[PDB]
Amino acid sequence: QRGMI
Amino acid sequence: GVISSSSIGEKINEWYMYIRRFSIPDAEYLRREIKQELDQMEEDQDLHLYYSLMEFRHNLMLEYLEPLEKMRIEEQPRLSDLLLEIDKKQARLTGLLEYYFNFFRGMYELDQREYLSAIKFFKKAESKLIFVKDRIEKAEFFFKMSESYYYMKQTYFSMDYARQAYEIYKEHEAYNIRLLQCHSLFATNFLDLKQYEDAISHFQKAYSMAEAEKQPQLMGRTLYNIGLCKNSQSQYEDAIPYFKRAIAVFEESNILPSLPQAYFLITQIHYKLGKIDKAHEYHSKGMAYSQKAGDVIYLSEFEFLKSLYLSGPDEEAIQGFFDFLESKMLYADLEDFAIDVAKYYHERKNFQKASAYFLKVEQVRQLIQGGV
């Protein structure tokens, strides 16, 4: 899961 | 009568500058005024094209900040078609207009997780970058490149592009949202590199700015990120309160496109550590959210949870899901998930499967290399 930019 | 293609062009550029500043009201006002003047000339296509491009951008911002579209039964979004209108007339435009077209189209493809598309568009924009006059525009571009590379785990390039954007944003008055976001990017990359000490620091500065800005999107997102960082460290229990808090903020102000991701990590956690009842409760909420937000991808990921924990383990389903992610260039999620799966098979009796999945991870890293 990737960060919420 | 003062108004002329040149008169409105300047007004449009002014309009753009407020968009970049995330200042919704000024933008709205300028847009409305500008629309009226446009209606008046009726004369020139390109000016209208410029307007359309800006409106597209304008909407990207609204969608981000107060995205939520508690759905009037049927007026939407202008995003889908506006994309259409511009797409229809893309040959008409050169110079700065060509840059904007590609840049904004890149931005859209980026939030659809069409990372391949996004990056091509961006490269194309980059070429036309010589037509860009002010330094903040370069900054926006750097910021977007950074964001895209982050999603692709191109850590060096992501981080370095964040630096470039930061330097330009910092020297400017009212770009706290983008500064906040740069910190997020710095942190999320540090997280990739395992540099937790740095990551935390940045996550936190980011969050702190989020509060000063009072923007629900960013608050939720910053919180989610802190929790993500905890989770990354395998310290699951500590991640929960940070996720829950983020959910509350996203729900509170109806930030629907953000909700699916939120639910997902929390959900995985509970199952992980055995608290199943909460798991289904979160799962259902998140599956439901991903439909409402039309996040088919997250929907599939939630199904994947189902696929693994219950009915444990639906290998054919897992394999399918991985092929999907792979064919969609979604290598980072693929890597994480492959890991979860291998570990999960390891704590359970049998290593045939776990070894195979660990082997899949290394493959994926080598492959993950190819891009740009």
Author numbering:
A (entry chain C): 44 to 48
B (entry chain A): 3 to 374
Manuscript excerpt for this entry:
In Bacillus, the Rap protein family modulates complex signaling processes mediated by two-component systems, such as competence, sporulation, or biofilm formation, by inhibiting the RR components involved in these pathways. The second subgroup, comprising RapC, RapF, RapG, RapH, and RapK, blocks the action of the target RR by a direct interaction with their DNA binding domain, and works as an anti-activator. For Rap proteins, regulatory peptides are called Phr and their mature active form is a penta- or hexa-peptide generated from a ∼40 amino-acid precursor by means of a post-transcriptional export-import process. As previously disclosed by the crystal RapF structure in complex with the DNA-binding domain of its RR target ComA, RapF was an all-helical protein consisting of two domains: a small N-terminal 3-helix bundle domain (residues 1–68) and a large C-terminal TPR domain (residues 98–370), both connected by a linker region (69–97).
The RapF-PhrF structure reveals that the inhibitory peptide was bound to the TPR domain. PhrF lies in an extended conformation, as described for several TPR-peptide complexes, and interacted with the residues of six of the seven TPR repeats (TPR2–TPR7). In particular, the strictly conserved Asn in the RNPP superfamily, Asn227 in RapF, emerged from TPR4 to bind by a hydrogen bond with PhrF Met4, and a Rap family conserved TPR2 Tyr (Tyr152 in RapF) bound the main chain oxygen of PhrF Gly3. The C-terminal PhrF oxygens interacted with Arg223 (TPR4) by a salt bridge, and with Gln183 (TPR3) and Tyr66 (3-helix bundle) by both hydrogen bonds. On the opposite end, Asp338 from TPR7 was salt-bridged with N-terminal PhrF nitrogen. The side chain of PhrF Arg2 was situated in a hydrophobic pocket formed by Tyr152, Lys155 (both from TPR2), and Ala334 (TPR7), which was closed by the conserved Asp194 (TPR3), which interacted with Arg2 via a salt bridge. PhrF placed on the concave side of the RapF TPR channel, similarly to that observed for PlcR and PrgX, two RNPP representatives, in complex with their regulatory peptides (PapR and cCF10, respectively). Peptide binding to RapF induced a severe constriction in the TPR channel (volume lowered to 4,954 Å3) and a large displacement of the 3-helix bundle domain (see below), which partially closed one of the channel faces. The conformational changes proved even more drastic in the 3-helix bundle domain, which underwent a rotation of around 155° in relation to the position observed in the peptide-free RapF structures. The structures reported here confirm that the ComA and PhrF binding sites are independent and corroborate that PhrF mediates action allosterically by the conformational changes described in the previous section. All together, the partial disruption and sterical obstruction of the ComA binding site explain PhrF-induced RapF inhibition.
